């Protein structure tokens, strides 16, 4: 059997957002910053909903990368307040709040945002004056721009601030002259057309699906898969690591999906994630004796009721035979009068009752009464012994039938098996409503198994009911048997179809998760084919953009994401179009690197807003520039 042949399963421990070590204030960064030439130093903050990434413009990578979360609480034992603002929170008490509105790119809890920024400036080593470059959501809300500016200029007093878009910084860092920028991030997916290094933000589109939504959706699907119960505490922080580690984009979803749960090869399509389970004769002899006596008592009680039914049925039988002894040679009125004493109405009803009692009985001062009761048991024993005689010789006759008419005898077993299955079907398909054989079926199928070379176990009724012929076992537990007793085989989830079903929401949002928005290929194709050729200032559209479709943000890092997008776009473009899909180098940090390289250029310093310009114009005002919002 396959589960006996298959190797032991390979299993992956659950991963979650966890603290690992402290990091001190990085005073060498402050030292290096004070050493830079005038107007060539800035603090660069990539304000990401998954990670805030921060560092110095003159360095090649962030010094900090922390979730935009705070935890603040009063210790009920020690009696003092504690406060935390990143991965310093163990994501020990997880009183967590998040700066962003859940599943969106917009900051809305400004108290968390200040705590996150306090942690940033502390760990960058600021103690008392530095220009700030901060990334911003596409089409970011003016109220959030205002609130962020107020914090930067009036809480922290910074000399100058500029906002730009993480998608576009990533593009310019990778030599983006002109192209279609495709960003899938934690919060969102965007397609932005970029022309002559300037983004055409009036033509940008947002999907409202991203790496957060995939973690939440993977969580819903797992809580549905194991809806009858799962012992581990399923958190979307865990399903995020499952989506990172195990999910991939299909190159032909319907053909890969339709075969995914087929038992052959599911061993290699499944992946198994295991939660931290706990491993759990005089005693037994005495208890078993008490059980054995209790069972014996139940057996005696059944036999005592059976013996009461034996004596009752034999006494009933004797009475009905006493009628028959009269009825033979007596009138219909005597027949009717004796039947009326039974309140029966037919001699053959007495025959049926006489036989049916015998058919039941065969299965199962004082001395004259006691022995005549024992003689009713001897009348029962005569039915019981005649039953024994009947069965022994009838079986020997059938053994001759097997020897003498083997093929017809096999053909009989088929005809009987079907007829018995028909009665079971006539029972069950009806009783499935009307409720509001089996050993005979087996015995027939057993001889068919024994000697009918046309028969197989796969047609056995039990095989129709077997777990390894089911689909939901493959879905929930894969190629291998399952028992709830094993603490190691409980506490594990089998990902199966969700390996591919979760990434495919980007391509099929309404069909898979009901998002009611166009898929990624349809968004990009609407821009390339319908919009940009209509926009009158543009030249060489679409073709100039097709030469660089560019992938950015962590939620693009799925395997086959590029080739899926290429093959999807290839069918929407005219034949021989020079379509190139390209990945960013290091598609997460690369948006910060773009902001850092841009930070002190003349283009950036023309776009900087000073504290005094902020006091003049207010916090909604922005210098419009290639990499930022209008």
């Amino acid at each position: 059997e396959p589960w006996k042949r298959l190797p032991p399963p390979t299993v992956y421990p659950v991963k979650e957002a966890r603290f690992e070590k402290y990091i001190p204030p990085q005073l060498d960064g402050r030292e290096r910053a004070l050493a830079q030439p005038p107007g060539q130093v800035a603090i660069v903050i990539d304000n990401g909903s998954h990670s805030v990434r921060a560092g110095w413009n003159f360095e090649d990578k962030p010094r900090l990368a922390i979730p935009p979360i705070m935890s603040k609480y009063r210790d009920r034992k020690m009696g003092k307040t504690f406060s935390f603002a990143g991965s310093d929170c163990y994501a020990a008490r997880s009183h967590i709040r998040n700066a962003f509105e859940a599943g969106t790119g917009i900051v809305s809890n400004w108290d968390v945002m200040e705590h996150v920024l306090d942690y940033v400036f502390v760990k960058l080593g600021m103690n008392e004056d530095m220009p700030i470059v901060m990334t911003e959501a596409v089409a970011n809300l003016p109220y959030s721009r205002k609130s962020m500016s107020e914090i930067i200029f009036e809480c922290y007093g910074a000399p100058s601030l500029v906002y730009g878009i993480d998608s576009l910084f990533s593009f310019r860092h990778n030599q983006g002259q002109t192209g279609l920028v495709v960003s899938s991030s934690y919060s969102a997916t965007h397609v932005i057309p970029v022309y002559n290094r300037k983004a055409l933000l009036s033509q940008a589109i947002r999907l409202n699906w991203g790496g957060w939504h995939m973690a939440e959706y993977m969580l819903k699907l797992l809580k549905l898969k194991y809806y009858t119960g799962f012992p581990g505490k399923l958190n979307s922080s865990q399903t995020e690591h499952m989506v990172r580690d195990f999910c991939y984009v299909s190159l032909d979803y319907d053909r890969e999906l339709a075969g995914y749960l087929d038992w052959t090869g599911l061993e290699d399509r499944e992946r198994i994630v295991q939660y931290p389970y706990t491993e759990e004769e005089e005693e037994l002899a005495r208890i078993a004796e008490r059980k054995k006596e209790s069972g014996r008592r139940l057996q005696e009680q059944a036999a005592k009721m059976r013996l009461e039914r034996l004596m009752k049925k034999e006494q009933e039988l004797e009475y009905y035979k006493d009628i028959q002894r009269r009825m033979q040679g007596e009138s219909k009125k005597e027949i009717k009068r004796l039947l009326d004493e039974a309140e029966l109405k037919d001699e053959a009803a007495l025959e049926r009752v006489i036989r049916d009692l015998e058919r039941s009985i065969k299965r199962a001062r004082q001395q004259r009464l006691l022995k005549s009761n024992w003689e009713a048991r001897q009348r029962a024993k005569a039915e019981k012994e005649a039953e024994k005689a009947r069965l022994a010789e009838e079986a020997r006759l059938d053994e001759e039938r097997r020897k003498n008419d083997l093929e017809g005898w096999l053909e009989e077993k088929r005809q009987l098996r079907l007829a018995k299955l028909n009665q079971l079907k006539e029972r069950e398909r009806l009783k499935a409503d009307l409720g509001n054989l089996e050993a005979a079926i087996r015995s027939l199928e057993n001889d068919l198994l024994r000697y009918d070379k046309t028969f197989s176990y796969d047609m056995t009724l039990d095989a129709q009911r077997d777990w390894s012929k089911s689909l939901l076992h493959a879905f929930r537990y894969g190629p291998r048997p399952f028992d709830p007793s094993s603490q190691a085989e409980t506490h594990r989830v089998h990902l199966n179809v969700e390996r591919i079903r979760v990434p495919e929401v980007l391509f099929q949002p309404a069909a898979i998760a009901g998002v009611d928005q166009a898929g990624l290929v349809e968004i990009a194709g609407d821009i390339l084919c319908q919009r940009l050729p209509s926009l009158p200032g543009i030249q060489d559209a679409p073709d100039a953009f097709l030469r660089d479709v560019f992938l950015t943000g962590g939620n693009t890092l799925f395997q086959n994401f590029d080739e899926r997008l290429r093959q999807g776009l290839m069918a929407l473009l005219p034949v021989g179009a020079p379509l190139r899909v390209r990945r960013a180098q290091d598609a997460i940090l690369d948006a910060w690197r773009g902001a850092a390289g841009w930070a002190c250029t003349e283009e950036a310093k023309a776009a900087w807003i000073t504290r005094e310009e902020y006091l003049e114009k207010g916090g909604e005002y922005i210098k419009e520039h290639d990499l930022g919002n209008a």
Binding site: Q567, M570, A571, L573, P574, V575, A577
Partner: protein
Amino acid sequence: EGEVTEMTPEEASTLLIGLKSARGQKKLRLDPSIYEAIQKERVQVGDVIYIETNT
């Protein structure tokens, strides 16, 4: 041979038919008479059609 993407009139009668395959799209200017052949076949947008453009 492709999925019909477009069937647009371009004459007072000449169509443009757009055809699509998994590997790209092409547009064909149709002679008024092969257009009627395509119209006698019950072709619509989203149908898959075969055309011998020479014959």
